[PDB]
Design an enzyme around this catalytic site. Structure first.
Site, mmCIF file in Angstrom:
data_model
loop_
_atom_site.group_PDB
_atom_site.id
_atom_site.type_symbol
_atom_site.label_atom_id
_atom_site.label_comp_id
_atom_site.label_asym_id
_atom_site.label_seq_id
_atom_site.Cartn_x
_atom_site.Cartn_y
_atom_site.Cartn_z
ATOM 1 N N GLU A 1 -10.680 7.497 5.091
ATOM 2 C CA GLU A 1 -10.237 8.760 4.677
ATOM 3 C C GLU A 1 -10.663 8.708 3.309
ATOM 4 O O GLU A 1 -10.754 7.831 2.342
ATOM 5 C CB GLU A 1 -8.392 8.676 4.555
ATOM 6 C CG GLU A 1 -7.970 9.824 3.905
ATOM 7 C CD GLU A 1 -6.383 9.858 4.007
ATOM 8 O OE1 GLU A 1 -6.024 9.033 4.544
ATOM 9 O OE2 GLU A 1 -6.036 11.051 3.528
ATOM 10 N N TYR A 2 -11.276 10.021 2.808
ATOM 11 C CA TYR A 2 -11.520 10.418 1.552
ATOM 12 C C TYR A 2 -10.652 10.915 0.592
ATOM 13 O O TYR A 2 -9.744 11.892 1.020
ATOM 14 C CB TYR A 2 -12.718 11.359 1.785
ATOM 15 C CG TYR A 2 -13.054 12.092 0.214
ATOM 16 C CD1 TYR A 2 -13.457 11.327 -0.868
ATOM 17 C CD2 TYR A 2 -12.915 13.577 0.337
ATOM 18 C CE1 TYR A 2 -13.772 12.013 -2.169
ATOM 19 C CE2 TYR A 2 -13.513 13.919 -0.825
ATOM 20 C CZ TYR A 2 -13.616 13.494 -2.109
ATOM 21 O OH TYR A 2 -13.894 14.158 -3.254
ATOM 22 N N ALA A 3 -10.214 10.439 -0.439
ATOM 23 C CA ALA A 3 -9.171 10.644 -1.229
ATOM 24 C C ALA A 3 -9.793 11.321 -2.481
ATOM 25 O O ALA A 3 -10.447 10.777 -3.390
ATOM 26 C CB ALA A 3 -8.434 9.629 -1.700
ATOM 27 N N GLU B 1 -4.413 0.462 -9.120
ATOM 28 C CA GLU B 1 -5.824 0.836 -8.699
ATOM 29 C C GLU B 1 -6.167 0.989 -7.367
ATOM 30 O O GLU B 1 -7.175 1.346 -7.041
ATOM 31 C CB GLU B 1 -6.895 -0.259 -9.485
ATOM 32 C CG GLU B 1 -6.309 -1.796 -9.297
ATOM 33 C CD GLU B 1 -5.633 -2.305 -10.505
ATOM 34 O OE1 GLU B 1 -4.375 -1.830 -10.866
ATOM 35 O OE2 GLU B 1 -5.704 -3.289 -10.814
ATOM 36 N N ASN B 2 -5.195 0.464 -6.624
ATOM 37 C CA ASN B 2 -5.375 0.516 -5.341
ATOM 38 C C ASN B 2 -4.263 1.744 -4.658
ATOM 39 O O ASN B 2 -4.044 1.718 -3.212
ATOM 40 C CB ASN B 2 -4.938 -0.751 -4.533
ATOM 41 C CG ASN B 2 -5.916 -1.844 -5.121
ATOM 42 O OD1 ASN B 2 -7.185 -1.498 -5.270
ATOM 43 N ND2 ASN B 2 -5.502 -3.076 -5.188
ATOM 44 N N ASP C 1 -5.325 -0.631 -0.281
ATOM 45 C CA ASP C 1 -5.777 -2.141 -0.443
ATOM 46 C C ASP C 1 -5.978 -2.852 1.119
ATOM 47 O O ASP C 1 -6.363 -4.146 0.857
ATOM 48 C CB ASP C 1 -4.950 -2.837 -1.415
ATOM 49 C CG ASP C 1 -3.403 -2.673 -0.969
ATOM 50 O OD1 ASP C 1 -3.121 -2.722 0.370
ATOM 51 O OD2 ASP C 1 -2.558 -2.885 -1.864
ATOM 52 N N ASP D 1 1.713 -7.348 -2.752
ATOM 53 C CA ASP D 1 1.748 -6.598 -4.089
ATOM 54 C C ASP D 1 0.964 -5.412 -4.147
ATOM 55 O O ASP D 1 0.056 -5.201 -3.534
ATOM 56 C CB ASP D 1 1.398 -7.664 -5.201
ATOM 57 C CG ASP D 1 -0.038 -7.987 -5.101
ATOM 58 O OD1 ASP D 1 -0.222 -9.065 -4.310
ATOM 59 O OD2 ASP D 1 -1.028 -7.782 -5.820
ATOM 60 N N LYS E 1 -16.165 -4.928 -5.362
ATOM 61 C CA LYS E 1 -16.786 -6.141 -5.570
ATOM 62 C C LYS E 1 -17.738 -6.540 -4.528
ATOM 63 O O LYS E 1 -18.674 -7.455 -4.925
ATOM 64 C CB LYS E 1 -15.470 -7.249 -5.132
HETATM 65 N N1 LIG Z 1 -11.412 6.288 0.259
HETATM 66 C C1 LIG Z 1 -11.627 6.444 -0.806
HETATM 67 N N2 LIG Z 1 -11.845 7.706 -1.452
HETATM 68 C C2 LIG Z 1 -12.129 8.192 -2.843
HETATM 69 N N3 LIG Z 1 -12.483 6.904 -3.678
HETATM 70 C C3 LIG Z 1 -12.589 5.809 -3.079
HETATM 71 C C4 LIG Z 1 -12.194 5.418 -1.833
HETATM 72 N N4 LIG Z 1 -12.338 4.200 -1.731
HETATM 73 C C5 LIG Z 1 -12.831 3.907 -3.007
HETATM 74 N N5 LIG Z 1 -13.084 4.676 -3.878
HETATM 75 C C6 LIG Z 1 -13.286 4.444 -5.098
HETATM 76 O O1 LIG Z 1 -14.505 3.565 -5.259
HETATM 77 C C7 LIG Z 1 -14.315 2.477 -6.076
HETATM 78 C C8 LIG Z 1 -14.520 1.106 -5.344
HETATM 79 O O2 LIG Z 1 -13.255 0.658 -5.079
HETATM 80 P P1 LIG Z 1 -12.869 -0.345 -3.824
HETATM 81 O O3 LIG Z 1 -13.363 -0.048 -2.768
HETATM 82 O O4 LIG Z 1 -11.196 -0.327 -3.764
HETATM 83 O O5 LIG Z 1 -13.432 -1.666 -4.304
HETATM 84 P P2 LIG Z 1 -12.980 -3.060 -4.249
HETATM 85 O O6 LIG Z 1 -13.154 -3.485 -2.695
HETATM 86 O O7 LIG Z 1 -13.435 -4.021 -5.244
HETATM 87 O O8 LIG Z 1 -11.203 -3.074 -4.507
HETATM 88 C C9 LIG Z 1 -12.768 2.640 -6.673
HETATM 89 O O9 LIG Z 1 -12.402 2.522 -7.924
HETATM 90 C C10 LIG Z 1 -12.223 3.992 -5.925
HETATM 91 O O10 LIG Z 1 -12.153 4.775 -7.349
#
Ligand SMILES: Nc1ncnc2c1ncn2[C@@H]1O[C@H](COP(=O)(O)OP(=O)(O)O)[C@@H](O)[C@H]1O
EC number: 2.7.11.1
Lengths: 109, 264
Positions: free
Chosen positions: B86-88, B135-136, B149, B131, B18
């Protein structure tokens, strides 16, 4: 030259008494508006969050760049080291030097 | 703040958020691979959530658990805030559910175990999570989920009214009806996720806001015929209108259906 001033640095209290800890971010225009409180109990290695509610209450004074934590009805179990920690409005990490609280007496009993 | 952008090599975008994008990156000295989440200050300020984020980032910095996404540090420049994460590598549980449609009982019970373990750890640190949405939930290299999150609270109870999320689907009745809430929200979340994992949609989903509000408030849900007796029992124990009637996390981890099906 910004500094967080946490008081009191050392506190000894008796059971049932109250303790207020104050943290002030001095010598900077950066704002302390986001303070969290933490405790490591005496003899323990685990840092815990101080959750607000019950015996624990907290205030913020935006005008003086300060925050306070009050613990009422102190118990022996409350003995430990207490710290304020925050990320200030300048996105900078701030932490107080800590309060070493000892609760001794006055009735166990 | 001591980390700086020049300390990192940036790779492909991991996705768009966002308030900015998330990139794959590596720290130049150690070559350690990580994710760099970039947030524009002006957008945070526009939405008026910058103060809240600073509170959450501070809380997140203390949480060290295999099923909680690790925050390694942060820094900023004139226009942006950078979170070092951390990279997931295996994506979101949301995406996994899109690909598989539904999860089997082993995958579901294992995920619920991981979440309950994470939430147990959180209780030991006295932080409250709000909650939990699929997606988080990110997935590590070994397929283990990570709560990602930063949605933490330090008031027990709380009267707070974030987040203007997408739908009401993951919110407990006490949050949508405007009452106080605390750690017992955890158990509602586990019930909603357990259902969604097995069925493919959350239990109170509807075509309108009105109907979703009503179904949550009334705890109006039904099971497809394939949902087994043990799953029904666990989910029905979790989705209680009265938060005080929901089980302890230990009771979830010890539930016969969980112990029968969890790989962990
Ligand atoms: N630490 C992470 N490792 C791998 N993928 C990520 C990571 N953080 C975010 N992403 C990817 O980047 C996208 C951006 O998500 P996010 O950062 O959660 O956005 P928002 O701040 O709108 O919630 C996510 O849909 C996710 O797939």
């Amino acid at each position: 030259m910004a500094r967080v001033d946490q008081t009191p640095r050392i506190a000894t209290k008796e059971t049932g008494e109250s303790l207020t800890i104050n943290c002030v971010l001095r010598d900077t225009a950066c704002a302390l508006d986001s303070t969290n409180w933490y405790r490591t109990k005496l003899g323990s290695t685990k840092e815990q969050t101080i959750s607000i509610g019950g015996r624990y209450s907290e205030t913020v004074d935006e005008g003086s760049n300060s925050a306070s934590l009050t613990i009422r009805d102190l118990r022996v179990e409350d003995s430990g080291t207490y710290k304020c920690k925050a990320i200030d409005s300048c996105w900078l990490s701030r932490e107080g030097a800590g309060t070493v609280l000892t609760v001794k007496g006055g009735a166990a009993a | 703040r001591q980390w700086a952008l020049e300390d990192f090599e940036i790779g492909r975008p991991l996705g768009k958020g966002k308030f900015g994008n998330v990139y794959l990156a590596r720290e130049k000295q150690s070559k350690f691979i990580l994710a760099l989440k970039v947030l524009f200050k002006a957008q945070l300020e526009k939405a008026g959530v910058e103060h809240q984020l600073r509170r959450e980032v501070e809380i997140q910095s203390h949480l060290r658990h295999p099923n909680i996404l690790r925050l390694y540090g942060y820094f900023h420049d004139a226009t942006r805030v950078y979170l070092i994460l951390e990279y997931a590598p295996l994506g979101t549980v949301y995406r996994e559910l899109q690909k598989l449609s539904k999860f089997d009982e082993q995958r579901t019970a294992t995920y619920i175990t991981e979440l309950a373990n994470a939430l147990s750890y959180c209780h030991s640190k006295r932080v409250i999570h709000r909650d939990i949405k699929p997606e988080n939930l990110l997935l590590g290299s070994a397929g283990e989920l990570k709560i990602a999150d930063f949605g933490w609270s330090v008031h027990a109870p709380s009267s707070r009214r974030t987040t203007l999320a997408g739908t009401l689907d993951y919110l407990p009745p006490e949050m949508i009806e405007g009452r106080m809430h605390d750690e017992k929200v955890d158990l509602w979340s586990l019930g909603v996720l357990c259902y969604e994992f097995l069925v493919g949609k959350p239990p109170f989903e509807a075509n309108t806001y009105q109907e979703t509000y009503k179904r949550i408030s009334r705890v109006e849900f039904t099971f497809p015929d394939f949902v087994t007796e043990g799953a029904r029992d666990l989910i029905s124990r979790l989705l209680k209108h009265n938060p005080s009637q929901r089980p302890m996390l230990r009771e979830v981890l010890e539930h016969p259906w969980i112990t029968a099906n969890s790989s962990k």
